[PDB]
């Protein structure tokens, strides 16, 4: 009884360029499945035309992963000359009790390292400063360094918010509602890696493993701009 995101033409292109992973890194729906009306409790269209992702459990996900129309996985040069841009209009509801962090957009390398996570966090402490109920950028310092540089991007609102990730040469920028919030962060530690975008709900370190993380996207796309 769930309506499919594919019923909205605004999602046709990104779904053609995606596969859906749930609840782990296994594919539940490829692009052609998504375009044929795939819908489930963890991936459906709301009555006001949001693509909603929902998932429970530690490090579980309902997430779109960038694909080429050819069916190849996206694997662009992480620090190449071609610009890669992901844009999304996201409404982050107040999260259920026991949900402590939800990753909503990523740049991921083609192995086991996220270049960038954009996530909602119940709290974070950075250089001795604690912020609560904020949206955060996390950029890993390298494949062999588990630590990351963290940047508060936005106070959490339930309002629809525009996020834009721009990746070109060895630099990554994030704009939130038109304002640059991370300006040309260095990602040269991923020289020689290949990369792809992800978007959805990725549930990080819940304190209630049966609570549902929930994230809504009004618009989503990922594109190339050739230099
Ligand atoms: O400052 C402080 O507060 C403290 O910070 C502390 O340190 C922090 C860090 O700062 C940071 O916050 C860190 O965050 C971690 C997150 O919490 C979270 O755990 C995150 O999890 C990652 C995970 O590490 C992996 O990278 C994982 O990768 C998966 C991918 O997303 C993707 O789904 C992959 O899908 C592939 C499949 O796995 C298969 O390989 C599949 O195979 C296909 C082949 O391509 C082939 O074609 C074949 O033939 O067909 C198959 C097929 O189709 O099936 O391909 C797919 C594919 O699509 O590519 O799978 C990956 C996987 O292996 O699982 O993803 C998540 C993610 O980001 O999504 O990791 C974060 C991190 O480690 O950075 O947490 C730290 C912490 O908490 O400790 C401290 O420094 C502290 O001191 C500070 O105070």
Contact residues of ligand 1, CB 6 A cut-off: 21, 25, 27, 59, 65, 73, 106, 108, 112-114, 117, 124, 138, 140, 146-148, 150, 202, 204
3-state secondary structure 159-217: CCEEEEEEEECCEEEEEECCEEEEEEEECHHHCCCEEEEEEEEEECCCCCCCCEEEEEE
- Looking from the CA of residue 25, the nearest atom of ligand 1 is 33
> Side by side, which strands form the sheet with 171-176?
43-45, 51-56, 212-225, 83-91, 161-168, 171-176, 179-186
* Closest residue to atom 8 of ligand 1, CA basis: 147
Mutation pick for ligand 1 pocket among 64, 114, 136, 142 (CB with most ligand atoms within 8 Å): 114
Among 218, 188, 219, 195, which Cα is nearest to 77's? 195
Residue boundaries of the structural domains of the chain: 1-227
Which residues precede chain breaks (C–N over 2.5 Å) in the chain? none
Cis peptide before 65 (omega within 30 of 0): no
The three-state secondary structure class of 56 is strand
Q: At 188, phi and psi to the nearest 5?
A: -65, -20
Determination technique used:
X-ray
* Closest residue to atom 61 of ligand 1, CA basis: 112
Identify the H or E element spanning 13: helix 12-16
């Amino acid at each position: 009884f769930y309506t499919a995101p594919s019923t909205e033409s605004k999602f046709t292109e990104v779904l053609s360029k995606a596969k859906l992973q749930y609840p782990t890194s296994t594919t539940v729906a490829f692009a052609d499945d998504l375009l044929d009306g795939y819908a489930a409790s963890y991936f459906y269209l709301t009555s006001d035309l949001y693509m909603q992702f929902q998932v429970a459990g530690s490090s579980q996900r309902s997430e779109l992963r960038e694909m080429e129309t050819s069916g190849d996985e996206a694997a662009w040069d992480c620090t190449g000359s071609t610009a890669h841009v992901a844009s999304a209009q996201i409404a982050i509801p107040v999260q259920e009790d026991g949900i402590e962090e939800v990753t909503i957009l990523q740049v991921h390398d083609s192995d086991v390292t996220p270049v960038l996570r954009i996530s909602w966090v119940s709290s974070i402490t950075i250089d001795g400063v604690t912020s609560e109920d904020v949206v955060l950028a996390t950029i890993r310092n390298g494949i062999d360094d588990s630590t990351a540089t963290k940047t508060v991007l936005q106070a959490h609102t339930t309002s629809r918010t525009e996020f834009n990730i721009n990746v070109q040469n060895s630099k990554l920028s994030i704009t939130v509602d038109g304002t640059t919030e991370l300006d040309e962060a260095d990602i040269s530690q991923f020289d020689g890696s290949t990369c792809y975008f992800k978007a959805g709900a990725f549930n990080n370190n819940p304190t209630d493993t049966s609570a549902n993380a929930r994230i809504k996207m009004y618009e989503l796309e990922w594109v190339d701009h050739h230099h």
